[PDB]
């Protein structure tokens, strides 16, 4: 493989007031997200400015995917990377109940019901990372090429591991549209919180939200 699934899984394993806590965990995980991306085959070989572009475009989705998956064990909420377990009621008190509910239902529940494994998660996140639509890429075609390599390696993995589930590759890819809508809604809220001067927004997270 020119995009080995075991190296994608290795990357996952290597890195393995609710609005305030979530924001704090986001800032923390942003450091670890860049370490993850460097471990994805061939990403650090792209132009630096493209690497910058891909992470600025995908960070919110990449992080939402990771905490959703981690949350498969918990009942009615979210395990943050800091170890705090955010639950429905605190979310709804804080005016972000709608988003929180979509995460639980469109992501955590579907990952749990299909038993998404970590190879599958890692591959999905690498697809998100290699987003050839991102504005300003110096070479959209080679990011598309790298995505196409993930797609091919993920599909082969699903045929090998889940031969009795021929629809499984499609079902995995069909989490991505819902992740994008959720991601856009999260960003909306955050730039909406910035617009009104709301919560404590820590250093790296603030940098991802500037223009």
């Amino acid at each position: 493989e020119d995009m080995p699934v075991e190296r994608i899984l290795e990357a996952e394993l290597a890195v393995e007031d609710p609005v305030t806590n979530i924001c704090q965990a986001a800032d923390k995980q942003l450091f670890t997200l860049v370490e993850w991306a460097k471990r994805i085959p061939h990403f650090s070989e792209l132009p630096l400015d493209d690497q910058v572009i891909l992470l600025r475009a995908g960070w919110n989705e990449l992080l939402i995917a990771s905490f959703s998956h981690r949350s498969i064990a918990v009942k009615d909420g979210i395990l943050l990377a800091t170890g705090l377990h955010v639950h429905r009621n605190s979310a709804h008190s804080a005016g972000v109940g709608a988003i929180f509910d979509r995460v639980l239902t469109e992501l955590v529940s579907k990952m749990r019901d299909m038993q998404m494994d970590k190879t599958e998660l890692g591959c999905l996140r690498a697809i998100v990372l290699f987003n050839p639509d991102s504005k300003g890429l110096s070479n959209p075609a080679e990011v598309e090429a790298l995505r196409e390599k993930v797609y091919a390696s993920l599909e082969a993995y699903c045929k090998h591991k889940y031969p009795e589930q021929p629809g499984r590759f499609a079902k995995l890819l069909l989490r991505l549209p819902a992740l994008r809508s959720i991601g856009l809604k999260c960003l909306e809220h955050l730039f909406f919180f910035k617009l009104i001067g709301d919560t404590p927004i820590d250093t790296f997270l603030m940098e991802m939200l500037e223009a």
Partner: peptide, 13 residues
């Protein structure tokens, strides 16, 4: 431009 992110990408693996 985006200083933390630039540094981290240029750092170790």
């Amino acid at each position: 431009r985006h200083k933390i992110l630039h540094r981290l990408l240029q750092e170790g693996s």
